[PDB]
Ligand binder design. Sequence first.
Ligand SMILES: CCC(=O)Nc1cc(Cl)c(Oc2ccc(O)c(-c3ccc(C(N)=O)cc3)c2)c(Cl)c1
Ligand SMILES: CCC(=O)Nc1cc(Cl)c(Oc2ccc(O)c(-c3ccc(C(N)=O)cc3)c2)c(Cl)c1
Lengths: 293, 297
Amino acid sequence: AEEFPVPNGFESAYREVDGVKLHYVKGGQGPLVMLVHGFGQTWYEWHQLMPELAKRFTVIAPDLPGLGQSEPPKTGYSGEQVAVYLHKLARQFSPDRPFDLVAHDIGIWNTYPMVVKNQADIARLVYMEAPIPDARIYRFPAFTAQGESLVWHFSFFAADDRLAETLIAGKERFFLEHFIKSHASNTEVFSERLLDLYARSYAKPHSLNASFEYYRALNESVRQNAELAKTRLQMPTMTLAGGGHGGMGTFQLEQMKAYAEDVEGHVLPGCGHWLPEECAAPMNRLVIDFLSR
Amino acid sequence: AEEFPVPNGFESAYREVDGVKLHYVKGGQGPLVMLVHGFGQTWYEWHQLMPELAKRFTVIAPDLPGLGQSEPPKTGYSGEQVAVYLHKLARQFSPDRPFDLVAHDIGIWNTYPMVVKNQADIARLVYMEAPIPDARIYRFPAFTAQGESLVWHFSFFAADDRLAETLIAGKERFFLEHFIKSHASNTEVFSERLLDLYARSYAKPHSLNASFEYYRALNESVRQNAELAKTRLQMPTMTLAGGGHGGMGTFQLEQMKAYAEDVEGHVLPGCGHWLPEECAAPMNRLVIDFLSRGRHH
Ligand SMILES: CCC(=O)Nc1cc(Cl)c(Oc2ccc(O)c(-c3ccc(C(N)=O)cc3)c2)c(Cl)c1
Ligand SMILES: CCC(=O)Nc1cc(Cl)c(Oc2ccc(O)c(-c3ccc(C(N)=O)cc3)c2)c(Cl)c1
């Protein structure tokens, strides 16, 4: 059965890529746009964007390996390894023309390498609410004068001994609610049913582990990206970031400027980290307009 | 009942201070030295140092409010509030003479205010392995090129909704072993037996909660110390830090130089955060020698 409700006119389906059965939800007609979710979530965070975007594009939203209904990666969880699966998946549906990429949160981590290495395959790029893993992440503070910092979980999740799985097991719903809301400006959008759905999904033991394995591979991703970044991105790029509590603000664009030649950026006041849910209407509009140019 | 074995010729006792029953272990004879433990531990971390000190000093090792066998504080958990309990306790056993102070980890947070506010009561001072709460702690990284950073737990522990209690309760022994060993260079000293003793103590629900309340009061302690630090410490001071994995390295001395006029520091190689256990011989020697420069025996 489906973990999340599929919007009318879309199909939930699977493709094997490099021996890994990936789940995705797909609909629309026209050139391909792939939407990639991040931590704590699945394809479903894009469910409000999808029907609108489907009016002009074929839309595909995969579950990251090990998350949602996708199988764990057989290679590893570093960005360069995971990006392979997402690239090949996109190419099954757009073998003959470039496709657009939209990524949120660790979806960025898991797509940047395939973008920079296959630039001819990427027409336009939208990145929102996560740093590309580089040495900038080592400057983020453990603790702040206002208390709990925004990224202390980097260390919690990266820790060995399965620290995170062990503490969070049986308390997935409680932990996820805290994590989402502490990174949100608009908390009201996360209803009990929505949180139930997400918690149920990432609580599958292989998915709870998959979640943290992305973070255990984070330093490897940074090292990979140090080499990859020698080539700047040449395709038109737009960044989005929340300007409210939990958001990344000016960091998103300012980082991307070091990576891309052709970038525009927006900061959305009153919005936190979870842009597609906290601020669906302006986020959708900005993405649709940027891609429809 | 005793959570930890009391060394021969020491007494385990309790003292009511401002409505709070504080547990302590005491022995020896001579001028007073108070030893103040930190997070994850109790008076017991000092148990190898104590019989050696007791040959030259009256030694007292209290359990911090809410930890070990001490009741939670009734005022609050900021450094300034908790310091009142420890200062009054010490002064009961040394009402007419200054005493010595040795503090490890959050023992520092909980003693600094009474040291700076009662400088004449403190003859000599030894601080090891924690920052004094100030704005420097806002500069420590959440994540490092080597993996989990050394103070990410500050935010974990300080988070609202009782995040840390809810996640950790029932898994106290697991968490502690990871926490201690990840902050250690010499991990081998933390036997399963020793980890069992410590975990048993902080698994007491009021103790697990008290542990975190110290971090929930950290910003307040930072604000308190900003005022208090306008006057430097005048008594002889020594800092110790671990040079190995989990230790604070040169940070300890460098921060202290901003706080004290008279400070000598040591960084112990091959030792991490838990100096009394990981590096017992050199640490004990450094502490005994430093305190023995003054009146004793
Ligand atoms: C511009 C520099 C500055 O002065 N401050 C600053 C400080 C920090 Cl902690 C910072 O990082 C941020 C912020 C807000 C955030 O929601 C996040 C964030 C949260 C979760 C993930 C996840 N799924 O792994 C990734 C990321 C990071 C950024 Cl981007 C900027
Ligand atoms: C990368 C930045 C850099 O240049 N230097 C640096 C980096 C870090 Cl992560 C750092 O933090 C450290 C180290 C060693 C430590 O034992 C601690 C530490 C751990 C727990 C407590 C407790 N009271 O719970 C107090 C203290 C912090 C220190 Cl002091 C310096």
